[PDB]
Design a binder for this molecule. Structure first.
Ligand SMILES: *[C@@H]1O[C@H](CO)[C@@H](O[C@@H]2O[C@H](CO)[C@@H](O[C@@H]3O[C@H](CO[C@H]4O[C@H](CO)[C@@H](O)[C@H](O)[C@@H]4O)[C@@H](O)[C@H](O[C@H]4O[C@H](CO)[C@@H](O)[C@H](O)[C@@H]4O)[C@@H]3O)[C@H](O)[C@H]2NC(C)=O)[C@H](O)[C@H]1NC(C)=O
Ligand SMILES: *[C@@H]1O[C@H](CO)[C@@H](O[C@@H]2O[C@H](CO)[C@@H](O[C@@H]3O[C@H](CO[C@H]4O[C@H](CO)[C@@H](O)[C@H](O)[C@@H]4O)[C@@H](O)[C@H](O[C@H]4O[C@H](CO)[C@@H](O)[C@H](O)[C@@H]4O)[C@@H]3O)[C@H](O)[C@H]2NC(C)=O)[C@H](O)[C@H]1NC(C)=O
Ligand SMILES: *[C@@H]1O[C@H](CO)[C@@H](O[C@@H]2O[C@H](CO)[C@@H](O[C@@H]3O[C@H](CO)[C@@H](O)[C@H](O)[C@@H]3O)[C@H](O)[C@H]2NC(C)=O)[C@H](O)[C@H]1NC(C)=O
Ligand SMILES: *[C@@H]1O[C@H](CO)[C@@H](O[C@@H]2O[C@H](CO)[C@@H](O)[C@H](O)[C@H]2NC(C)=O)[C@H](O)[C@H]1NC(C)=O
Ligand SMILES: *[C@@H]1O[C@H](CO)[C@@H](O)[C@H](O)[C@H]1NC(C)=O
Ligand SMILES: *[C@@H]1O[C@H](CO)[C@@H](O)[C@H](O)[C@H]1NC(C)=O
Ligand SMILES: *[C@@H]1O[C@H](CO)[C@@H](O)[C@H](O)[C@H]1NC(C)=O
Ligand SMILES: *[C@@H]1O[C@H](CO)[C@@H](O)[C@H](O)[C@H]1NC(C)=O
Ligand SMILES: [Ca+2]
Ligand SMILES: [Ca+2]
Ligand SMILES: [Zn+2]
Ligand SMILES: [Zn+2]
Ligand SMILES: [Zn+2]
Ligand SMILES: [Zn+2]
Lengths: 816, 737
């Protein structure tokens, strides 16, 4: 006989089933796989179907296991001869297998709050359902959230495609000076439409006659354009997760004239366990597994309705999670004392404003305060920023809702006004720089639209608005996502993106102007040979040769609406010169690995470009011992190896720009030591440098109206000082190819703030190698970020498709 | 029917055994590489081990021995000995006197000559107690020509369930065949730790796997009516750490590709030359060690000649240990080149046994161990004695302080005693007549005879100077025959060796409000008339002496009554020989640090003194050995301390000064006395940084000091001996975070 139904029970029969049988040799021959191996295996087998229920077992195959919800993975397959969704081998859904009632597969946006990308990297092997969606769907190791990395801003960005600065919800707590009211999830203000700007996707769907069923989502229980989703629930976090899923499974079974084509679904885990117990806790592993089973519940649900090959699922997260520490909490009362005149939004992305509402608010002198708090301590883990001086990549300035004074915290650090304001400091948190690795987010696309088993590089969550529009078949509202940049996630792209066209025609700068005295004493070192003037008759039509050497990927295209531009060709660079501003908009050149460039001194030597109008600010006299500002070169002076003298063309008046002395430190180091290194390390490097004007800090190139207003007079001469300086490095992926012959491109891009001091960098004690390189890295940006803020368009002549180039251009590296 | 894990906690005050069992046996259950932290973080995924913890006696960390490897620690647990003593110093090792190498994969594994000391099953055998070891290091070997009564030759392929069923069956054997001691050994979570790293899915799985097997056993014992009649020690050998190819040091960078040296790769790497064993002793490791010292700005490895490793590690006294060892920073590892090392991405261990992630698991559950008691960290060598007390065995001589774990037990078997004095407490009458020491003292300084006349005014109050100096009892001299005076002064008590003409210890109390003088006191000594005048007590001897200087065991800047310098501190009985370079360390420690600790702890009590361990066996040197290591410096015979010890003590309650503690707080250090400071690679650094780092590295147990000096502290304290044995054996964990 067997031990079935007799495990550790009785002895009378010829063979025993109790622990005494091993010493005696009395064991029934299945005692091991009937009563012992179930004590520490989690998987059913032929011996266990219809077993006696025992507590000792990890996992049950007893018939009564369905009621208690403790069956094994394979209780369905082994003991009931049919499988769960998770168990079925991967299959390629090239065309959607739908029921006859369904005219096309709907999309479901399933959000797991605080599911940091890393959870799946590390704990993937404890999460077979989500792992199957990943392996059978389209995955990315990181999806970049928006700053601040909080729940409301990001959830609303996903469904709008907008930056928080634009869509209105900049944090779960915020105050508006023009409404004179505060926003809070716990408040009634939550349901006031005036907060939620932009167009959410369900409103987009409504305007184009597509139904929507949102179980939970930020915004969906609000009349945004006087429009709610067709089905929707007012937020109540107490509603068990299973109800949430059953309810959407039921909405899917509704008749077609009642049935949504778009769905959302939202769970508060693993976020909740993330705060209470931290991201490396037992409680999070439990929350993770809990949520994996609920994603499984849904998949079986869809499998039971014959929809599991007829649904486009985006499984997604708002932000990641990080471990807090009472040892990594900054309190301002230390530098300020206990003060009553300021409110601080505590956290890693802390913001500050004065108490008076809103009379004191604008004229409070935040500059003074910000300076007070700057560089107080040796390795300060917080840095005060007036919001237009935050990094442009964060896109966190253009809103009254955002306070004038913000704080940037180092990873793991948080700020409050004092110990009483903050939450408990030992908790998990989020909100930090959206490029920190632990703030990265989850994205898996699975369905008949998404490629199977495709892994892709990180993209920002604002790109998803357009994707869901393409999936639902909707014309997207204007957003900050580059339409078509995610085509590589899809089997068959709906949208084919185009390069933007140049607005106008270009003007001619011919060599006309007569030489004036610029008032420069040039060294004997410099080589302005009489013949130099000939060089000015070089044109771009000097096909490739020098033209290709300067702009091998195509020349930047001017998108500025009406803006008079010359293309000035030189031997080793090409300048795009604005006649409107009498200033170069960009210079483009290629530093080959073997190229040298001289550290001879070129103080006070300028060469009047005869092709352009002579401004009083092109003259050396203007800067001669000028304490207020100086000038800089968009292309460094480089050496002619055969003569061993410098290319004078770099000293042309069309190659200079206004530049604070302090910034020159950054600009010098970048060119003197760094650009040489990158050239060496990448087998050559291609540069496009240029000034930037974003005085309204809206992240986009300034109107000519706005430029007028921000011109200033310095030596009784009108001059316009760049808000930032941009640079776009480009080289081949294959180190065997120089930038003039890349098969595929590698792109870095920066938008360096142009500030008249360097307090941002707290230089005292440091070395330039340390602090300048740190500053570049902090102000790293997307190529697209440059494009938006300058009105230029790169890489247009490249053989690659536009959607390919849109990936290259929207990319940004993750920190750590 | 409930399983064991399911049943409510119950207090087993007396063991409920079957009639066949006359007393509860003990089972030593080892989970390899189960780092203490696994239970801290993943406890809520481990209900069985969590129940044992909550219903038993737990410690958040059990300190393993250095190096934190599998064989050394497993054998230390069952011996109570340091690896330097018990012979197994690593899983791979070479002996010059046997001219053979030891390897787990080798046949040498079974050679008895490697396994020194007495394992507990051999102890049991000698005292007629049977033993069943399922797996353990040593147990498949004839140590004293003795094997355990039941034993298995190691085979890691044997499934874990067989291992447990087999012990459960041995428990059911007839009493004349049945073991009273059992071991049981699993290779997880260690294996998953290496392959996939601590903090991987695979480790969580391994952890849960092992939790269920501990559960299998508990149900097993519950089915035999033994689950209230068994003393279980659930234990681990060491912890685990994540490796990285970015944190691997390769010596070929500084040496080139050389064929004349072998390196044991890892975090506790050791080096010896290839020739076996002709080149081995006369290779000049000094030169090499210096070559490799301070080569790079934040070097994460540091070469050590093995007697200069920290004394707390107890890792020098063995031929098996190579002359040149390396100390690595947390997470770092060293090899000769990329080819020697294992794959660098793996998990590893072996690092400093005070790193947090090397800490180990210990849970005691049974009718002997308190239920739901959490205790402070202890070292695994303490377990030998505990298991002797549990099995009822007289323990072989080990390095564990017998009785220091009594607080883990409901009813202690052993009541420890303070060791009695054996040195010869001789008189020192004030007899010596004043010679010229050749010191030009400043006018600033106050002379000695006046010092009492000076003394009365502002100083009148009645209070006790003996208690003010040694409030916890005076150190007791355990040195076998050693002539000692107790020299009383106003603010300190010096225990003065007449044999060495040198103070063995000075004891004093720096009260929070004690004034600290800023006066300059160069070249001023006061001949103590109570002691014999040595030529080495004279200032002239050190006058512009480049070779060495002297130092004070009690700072002269410390002074209760005034802004002036304490004259009694400049007595010739308060000085010791001291390299100029070490003075940097010693000055900072007293000028800035001691003041701070005094402030931060509402006063501080100090006991400083020299140390002589020339044979580097961790114990006070024989007078024979001291003779041999004497040297002549200014044509004068002098013996230079190998280390300097210091023992700080203050109250736990900050409201109490050290003279009135209810409970004590103890730090202790054994600072190496080296003639340069290359250990600290000072260039570029500040003293605050590098001196404080050095103290921390050379922190030690109070007991470590006791062993190496022959002194015995805190004897007059009201607390029991076993209480004080906790205080004395304690050491802080280096927190990673
Ligand atoms: C991220 O993506 C979003 C959307 O794609 C972009 O946000 C838009 O940005 C533009 C420019 O900042 C905004 O356009 C401006 O809107 C203002 C308000 O418009 C309403 O209110 C006025 C009443 O004052 C109504 O009359 C009008 O019909 C609107 O209902 C206007 O004040 C601005 O007008 C200016 O430009 C026009 C050109 O048409 C001039 O003729 C005017 O004189 C004036 O100077 C302008 O229209 C738009 O509001 C933003 N939309 C949203 C949703 O935020 C972000 O720019 C983008 N960020 C990126 C890519 O970095
Ligand atoms: C950790 O704990 C261990 C064990 O408790 C300590 O190590 C032991 O220390 C003892 C002394 O306490 C050591 O004893 C020494 O034994 C050596 C070898 O002795 C054997 O061989 C000789 C012949 O070669 C035989 O005659 C002898 O009987 C033994 O069989 C000797 O080299 C030593 O001899 C010296 O001292 C004795 C004692 O007075 C003199 O009579 C001799 O003339 C000679 O000078 C000595 O007897 C013992 O080896 C160690 N045992 C073990 C198991 O390691 C550690 O010290 C301790 N560590 C710390 C830090 O405290
Ligand atoms: C070291 O231990 C391992 C594990 O026990 C040994 O491997 C085991 O070898 C045995 C015998 O070769 C195998 O046992 C089984 O026998 C039955 C015969 O009816 C058969 O049904 C099974 O397929 C199997 O052959 C077994 O595969 C294997 N593993 C286990 C868990 O038993 C190994 O032999 C030991 N000795 C060494 C390495 O010297
Ligand atoms: C550069 O080229 C222009 C033509 O684009 C030259 O212009 C001529 O200059 C001469 C002498 O100054 C005049 O007499 C002509 O009227 C100009 N244009 C003609 C003939 O087409 C100019 O001289 C050239 N400059 C240099 C430095 O080479
Ligand atoms: C929230 O949900 C729970 C679910 O059981 C319910 O009992 C409770 O009444 C709900 N509250 C509101 C305000 O809807
Ligand atoms: C900052 O403000 C405080 C008062 O809040 C003032 O005492 C201090 O001088 C200011 N600046 C600095 C750099 O300390
Ligand atoms: C030690 O081992 C080596 C290895 O071959 C051998 O050559 C040598 O003779 C042995 N003995 C000595 C004393 O070197
Ligand atoms: C370290 O060893 C290398 C071996 O080539 C040598 O060149 C270097 O000078 C050595 N450093 C010393 C002896 O200090
Ligand atoms: Ca702008
Ligand atoms: Ca010694
Ligand atoms: Zn969230
Ligand atoms: Zn959260
Ligand atoms: Zn081990
Ligand atoms: Zn290991």
């Amino acid at each position: 006989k067997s031990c079935k139904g007799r495990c550790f029970e009785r002895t009378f029969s010829n063979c025993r089933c109790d622990a005494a049988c091993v010493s005696l040799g009395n064991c029934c021959l299945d005692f091991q796989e009937t009563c012992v191996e179930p004590t520490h295996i989690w998987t059913c087998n032929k011996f266990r179907c219809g077993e006696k229920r025992l507590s000792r077992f990890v996992c049950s195959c007893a018939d009564d296991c369905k009621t208690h919800n403790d069956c094994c993975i394979n209780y369905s397959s082994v003991c009931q001869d049919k499988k769960s969704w998770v168990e079925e081998t991967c299959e390629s859904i090239d065309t959607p297998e739908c029921p006859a009632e369904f005219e096309s597969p709907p999309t479901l946006l399933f959000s797991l709050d605080g599911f940091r990308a890393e959870y799946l990297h590390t704990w993937g092997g404890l999460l077979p359902v989500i792992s199957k969606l990943k392996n059978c769907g389209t995955y990315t190791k990181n999806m970049r959230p928006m700053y601040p990395t909080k729940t409301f801003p990001n959830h609303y960005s996903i469904v709008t495609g907008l930056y928080p600065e634009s869509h209105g919800i900049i944090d779960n707590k915020m105050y508006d000076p023009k409404m004179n009211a505060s926003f809070s999830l716990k408040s009634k203000e939550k349901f006031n439409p005036l907060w939620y700007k932009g167009q959410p996707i369900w409103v987009t769907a409504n305007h184009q006659e597509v139904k929507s069923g949102t179980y939970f989502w930020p915004g969906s229980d609000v009349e945004i354009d006087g429009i709610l989703p067709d089905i929707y629930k007012v937020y109540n976090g107490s509603v068990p997760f299973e109800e949430r899923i059953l309810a959407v499974l039921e909405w899917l079974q509704l008749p077609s004239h009642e049935r949504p084509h778009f769905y959302t679904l939202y769970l508060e885990e693993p976020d909740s366990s993330g705060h209470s117990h931290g991201p490396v806790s037992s409680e999070v592993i439990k929350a993770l597994q809990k949520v994996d089973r609920l994603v499984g519940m849904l998949m079986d649900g869809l499998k039971d309705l014959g929809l599991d090959k007829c649904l486009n699922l985006i499984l997604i997260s708002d932000h990641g999670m990080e471990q807090g520490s009472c040892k990594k909490y900054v309190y301002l009362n230390k530098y300020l004392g206990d003060v009553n005149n300021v409110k601080v939004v505590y956290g890693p992305a802390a913001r500050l404003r004065p108490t008076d509402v809103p009379e004191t608010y604008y004229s409070f002198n935040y500059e003074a305060l910000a300076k007070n708090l700057s560089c107080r301590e040796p390795n300060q883990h917080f840095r005060p920023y007036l919001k237009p001086f935050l990094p442009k990549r964060l896109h966190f300035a253009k809103s009254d809702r955002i306070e004038p004074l913000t704080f940037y915290l180092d990873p793991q650090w948080q700020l409050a006004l004092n110990p009483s304001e903050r939450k408990y400091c030992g908790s998990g948190f989020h909100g930090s720089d959206n490029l920190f690795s632990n703030m990265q987010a989850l994205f898996i696309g699975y369905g008949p639209a998404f490629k199977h088993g495709a892994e892709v590089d990180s993209f920002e969550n604002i790109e998803v608005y357009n994707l869901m529009c393409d999936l639902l078949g909707l014309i997207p509202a204007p957003n900050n996502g580059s339409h078509g940049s995610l085509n590589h996630l899809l089997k068959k792209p709906i949208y084919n993106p185009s390069h933007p066209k140049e607005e106008g025609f270009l003007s001619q700068c011919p060599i006309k102007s007569t030489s004036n005295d610029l008032g420069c004493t040039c060294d004997p070192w410099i080589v302005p040979i009489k013949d130099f003037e000939k060089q000015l008759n070089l044109t771009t039509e000097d096909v490739d040769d020098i033209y290709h050497m300067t702009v091998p990927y195509g020349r930047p295209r001017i998108l500025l609406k009406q803006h008079h531009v010359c293309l000035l060709q030189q031997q080793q660079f090409l300048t795009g010169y604005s006649l409107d501003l009498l200033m170069p908009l960009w210079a483009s050149y290629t530093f080959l690995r073997n190229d040298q460039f001289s550290r001879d001194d070129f103080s006070n030597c300028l060469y009047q470009d005869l092709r352009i109008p002579l401004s009083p600010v092109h003259k050396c006299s203007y800067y001669k011992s000028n304490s207020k500002l100086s000038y800089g070169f968009l292309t460094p002076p480089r050496l002619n190896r055969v003569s061993n003298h410098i290319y004078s063309e770099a000293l042309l008046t069309s190659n200079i720009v206004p530049m604070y002395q302090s910034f020159q430190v950054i600009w010098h180091y970048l060119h003197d030591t760094l650009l040489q290194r990158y050239a060496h390390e990448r087998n050559g490097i291609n540069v496009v440098s240029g000034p930037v004007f974003d005085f309204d800090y809206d992240g986009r190139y300034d109107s000519l109206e706005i430029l007028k207003q921000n011109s200033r007079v310095i030596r009784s001469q009108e001059i316009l000082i760049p808000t930032h300086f941009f640079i776009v490095l480009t080289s081949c992926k294959q180190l065997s190819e120089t930038p003039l012959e890349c098969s595929a491109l590698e792109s870095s891009a920066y938008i360096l703030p142009h500030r008249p001091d360097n307090i941002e960098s707290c230089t005292h004690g440091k070395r330039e190698s340390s602090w300048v390189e740190e500053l570049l890295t902090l102000h790293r940006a997307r190529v697209t970020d440059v494009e938006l803020i300058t009105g230029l368009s790169f890489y247009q002549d490249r053989q690659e498709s536009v959607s390919e180039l849109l990936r290259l251009k929207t990319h940004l590296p993750i920190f750590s």
